[PDB]
Amino acid sequence: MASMERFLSVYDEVQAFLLDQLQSKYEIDPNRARYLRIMMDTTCLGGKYFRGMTVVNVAEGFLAVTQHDEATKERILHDACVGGWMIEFLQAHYLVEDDIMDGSVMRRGKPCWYRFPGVTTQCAINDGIILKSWTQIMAWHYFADRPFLKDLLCLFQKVDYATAVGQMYDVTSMCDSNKLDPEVAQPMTTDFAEFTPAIYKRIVKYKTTFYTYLLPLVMGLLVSEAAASVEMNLVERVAHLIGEYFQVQDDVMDCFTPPEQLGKVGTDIEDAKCSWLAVTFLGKANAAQVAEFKANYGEKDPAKVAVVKRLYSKANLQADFAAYEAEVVREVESLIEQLKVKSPTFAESVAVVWEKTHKR
Amino acid sequence: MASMERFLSVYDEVQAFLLDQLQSKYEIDPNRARYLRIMMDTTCLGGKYFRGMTVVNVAEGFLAVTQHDEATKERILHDACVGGWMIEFLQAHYLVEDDIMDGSVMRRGKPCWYRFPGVTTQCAINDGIILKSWTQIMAWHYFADRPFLKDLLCLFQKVDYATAVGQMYDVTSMCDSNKLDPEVAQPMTTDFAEFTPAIYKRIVKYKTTFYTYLLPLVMGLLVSEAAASVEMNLVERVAHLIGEYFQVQDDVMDCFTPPEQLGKVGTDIEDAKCSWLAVTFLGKANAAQVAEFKANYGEKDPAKVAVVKRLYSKANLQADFAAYEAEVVREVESLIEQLKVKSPTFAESVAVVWEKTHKR
Numbered sequence: 021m022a023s024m025e026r027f028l029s030v031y032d033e034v035q036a037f038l039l040d041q042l043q044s045k046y047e048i049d050p051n052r053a054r055y056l057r058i059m060m061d062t063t064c065l066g067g068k069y070f071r072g073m074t075v076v077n078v079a080e081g082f083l084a085v086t087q088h089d090e091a092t093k094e095r096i097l098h099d100a101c102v103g104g105w106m107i108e109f110l111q112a113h114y115l116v117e118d119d120i121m122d123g124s125v126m127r128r129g130k131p132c133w134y135r136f137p138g139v140t141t142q143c144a145i146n147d148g149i150i151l152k153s154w155t156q157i158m159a160w161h162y163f164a165d166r167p168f169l170k171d172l173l174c175l176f177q178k179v180d181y182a183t184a185v186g187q188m189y190d191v192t193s194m195c196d197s198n199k200l201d202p203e204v205a206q207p208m209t210t211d212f213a214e215f216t217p218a219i220y221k222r223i224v225k226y227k228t229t230f231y232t233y234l235l236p237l238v239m240g241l242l243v244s245e246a247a248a249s250v251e252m253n254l255v256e257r258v259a260h261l262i263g264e265y266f267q268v269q270d271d272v273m274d275c276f277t278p279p280e281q282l283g284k285v286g287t288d289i290e291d292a293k294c295s296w297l298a299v300t301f302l303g304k305a306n307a308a309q310v311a312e313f314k315a316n317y318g319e320k321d322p323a324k325v326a327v328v329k330r331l332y333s334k335a336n337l338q339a340d341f342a343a344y345e346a347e348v349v350r351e352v353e354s355l356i357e358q359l360k361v362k363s364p365t366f367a368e369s370v371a372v373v374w375e376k377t378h379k380r
Numbered sequence: 381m382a383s384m385e386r387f388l389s390v391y392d393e394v395q396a397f398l399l400d401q402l403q404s405k406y407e408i409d410p411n412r413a414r415y416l417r418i419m420m421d422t423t424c425l426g427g428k429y430f431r432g433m434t435v436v437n438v439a440e441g442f443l444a445v446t447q448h449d450e451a452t453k454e455r456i457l458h459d460a461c462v463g464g465w466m467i468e469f470l471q472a473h474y475l476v477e478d479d480i481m482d483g484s485v486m487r488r489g490k491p492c493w494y495r496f497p498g499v500t501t502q503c504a505i506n507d508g509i510i511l512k513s514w515t516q517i518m519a520w521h522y523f524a525d526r527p528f529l530k531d532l533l534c535l536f537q538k539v540d541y542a543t544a545v546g547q548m549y550d551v552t553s554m555c556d557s558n559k560l561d562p563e564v565a566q567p568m569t570t571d572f573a574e575f576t577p578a579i580y581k582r583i584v585k586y587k588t589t590f591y592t593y594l595l596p597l598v599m600g601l602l603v604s605e606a607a608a609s610v611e612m613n614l615v616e617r618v619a620h621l622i623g624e625y626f627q628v629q630d631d632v633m634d635c636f637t638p639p640e641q642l643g644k645v646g647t648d649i650e651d652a653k654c655s656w657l658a659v660t661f662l663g664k665a666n667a668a669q670v671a672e673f674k675a676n677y678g679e680k681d682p683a684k685v686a687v688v689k690r691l692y693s694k695a696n697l698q699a700d701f702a703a704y705e706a707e708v709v710r711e712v713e714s715l716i717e718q719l720k721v722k723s724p725t726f727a728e729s730v731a732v733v734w735e736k737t738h739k740r
């Protein structure tokens with residue numbers, strides 16, 4: 021059976037489980053079950069399933085080189101699909117809550133969930149809570165007797181927590197650290213002293229790379245009982261590397277990809293985000309360029325947003341991007357090699373992850 | 381050592397752990413650590429610690445009747461304090477997120493967290509996420525080697541999920557079920573057909589009673605390795621009973637307790653909540669009273685809120701309350717007796733929980 025159709029079929033299975041349990045154990049009524057069904061579909065479906073399918077791909081790699089009974093291959097593939105959905109539902113939690121946090125309008129060409137007329141923020145914050153709760157109910161039901169249950173739960177736990185901390189670094193990235201204070205309304209930085217490569221790197225490492233690249237790779241290893249085929253420090257290294265590259269691309273598209281292709285209107289400039297563009301610009305600007313950027317960044321006024329786009333265009337940031345790209349291609353290819361030693365399969369799965377990132 | 385000072389000391393210990401880990405493992409800087417410290421204190425401290433201290437009380441009960449080395453009594457009491465904080469931090473998550481959901485202003489006489497000038501909703505939704513995340517980091521660190529880790533995690537999981545589902549029943553309690561629809565903006569009910577005792581009971585059972593009464597009692601049993609001293613169906617029964625009574629009292633105070641004593645301005649009438657008062661009123665009103673209530677409920681206009689308070693005052697709902705009270709006192713005393721058989725200690729702890737509820 022093809023991997024994607026397996027994955028999709030398991031979504032239907034998990035959804036039926038979750039809603040049937042709500043009816044048998046949690047006293048839900050049919051209309052609320054239907055609300056939750058629609059919420060799950062709307063928030064979990066319609067992407068490429070990169071994260072979830074990476075767990076399945078990693079597990080298919082090890083199945084090709086490991087001896088098992090057919091029924092055991094099916095159990096492993098079923099566990100990889102459930103684990104993959106746990107990651108998709110965790111991503112759905114963070115996208116629902118982020119969208120509300122940031123006052124986002126669209127995502128992928130459709131309204132953010134909280135904007136649906138019969139949802140509202142009051143319901144959508146708790147719908148997002150529920151999405152994450154569902155990842156735990158999946159794991160305790162499907163993996164109850166599994167040897168990897170504890171490891172999987174503990175890993176998922178740490179990744180969730182890293183992601184929340186990274187949301188904390190992201191939402192505070194335009195403030196001066198020494199001024200953070202719950203008592204005092206937060207001004208936007210004026211010096212931009214914290215728009216540096218290492219600070220940027222910390223934001224992206226925690227906000228994105230743990231759930232998007234580390235978790236899928238590691239969950240694939242866990243459902244396969246294959247953590248001995250890797251040096252886990254290397255898998256963490258490659259995950260954070262590839263995932264930083266991913267975000268650098270998202271930062272560039274927020275500014276430069278037309279909103280119909282982007283699936284939303286990018287507001288990183290108005291939101292004064294610490295993007296790769298801002299940091300890279302400041303790393304090469306002269307005194308007058310720095311002044312013009314300070315006078316214009318983090319302002320809704322479209323004339324001022326156009327002055328920042330203008331400054332970036334004229335700064336040749338394409339060249340710094342090609343150079344970054346080159347260096348990542350170099351370091352990922354090195355880490356692939358290091359992974360090839362203990363596991364060719366796993367190294368190939370990493371290679372595929374890299375190809376799907378580097379191409380898009 | 382006195383229980384409360386033990387409990388409080390463990391808060392300092394856990395907080396230092398959590399923030400020190402953020403510095404050693406999650407690359408946090410001092411200013412963000414301080415933000416999180418203040419957020420933890422503000423959101424977790426200043427209540428009566430009923431929930432957390434109930435875990436400690438239950439564990440002290442069993443220590444009096446069970447043979448142990450002193451070092452084992454200290455480990456049990458330390459585990460009961462950590463478990464108690466897990467419940468306090470879980471409550472803190474739900475109060476932060478609820479407050480944002482409901483557009484609340486104050487709680488306990490102080491501004492809701494999201495209203496602090498240097499917080500904002502954008503940060504506060506993720507601060508609430510973090511609060512819950514912290515309950516998992518506590519459990520995996522402090523209870524890593526414990527025989528009860530799996531049971532405790534699985535119980536906490538189910539209780540969290542029940543609470544989220546109960547938030548779903550609460551926020552939708554003024555809508556007609558058959559009209560729930562993410563696509564369509566939700567009208568307030570006009571018939572009030574769903575303001576019934578069993579529907580009310582479902583809302584309160586899930587929103588409050590699992591985390592406030594079941595979890596503390598059960599967590600006390602788990603850290604004590606004492607689940608064999610109870611019939612768990614009875615402990616669930618008594619928890620939901622006592623916790624319904626609790627909420628009936630909160631529903632009556634929302635309407636009738638002056639805001640300086642209440643610690644907030646009650647808006648259940650304007651919010652069209654399915655409160656005990658509304659349900660009990662509708663259960664005894666004549667045709668003209670029902671019409672006047674429909675014409676006035678769920679409206680911000682203070683004149684219309686005063687007409688509902690008026691209708692409730694004249695309906696003698698005090699009498700229905702005394703009758704409810706009587707019947708709960710009766711059924712709790714029966715369940716205490718049933719618990720006394722397998723465990724006098726545990727039955728006494730339940731008795732104390734009941735006294736602290738029934739008195740307040």
Ligand SMILES: CC(=O)NCC1(c2ccccc2)CCOCC1
Nearest residue numbers: 175178179182230234405406407
């Ligand atoms: C510095 C750094 O890389 N921290 C991430 C840690 C991690 C690893 C893997 C998944 C989630 C969290 C934090 C907890 O301890 C292990 C490292």
Ligand SMILES: CC(=O)NCC1(c2ccccc2)CCOCC1
Nearest residue numbers: 045046047535538539542590594
């Ligand atoms: C009908 C009812 O009481 N449901 C609550 C359940 C529960 C029990 C204890 C803690 C959390 C959840 C739901 C899951 O299965 C067990 C019953």
Ligand SMILES: [Zn+2]
Nearest residue numbers: 118121122190
């Ligand atoms: Zn965001």
Ligand SMILES: [Zn+2]
Nearest residue numbers: 270271274288
């Ligand atoms: Zn972006």
Ligand SMILES: [Zn+2]
Nearest residue numbers: 478481482550
């Ligand atoms: Zn609420």
Ligand SMILES: [Zn+2]
Nearest residue numbers: 630631634648
């Ligand atoms: Zn209330």
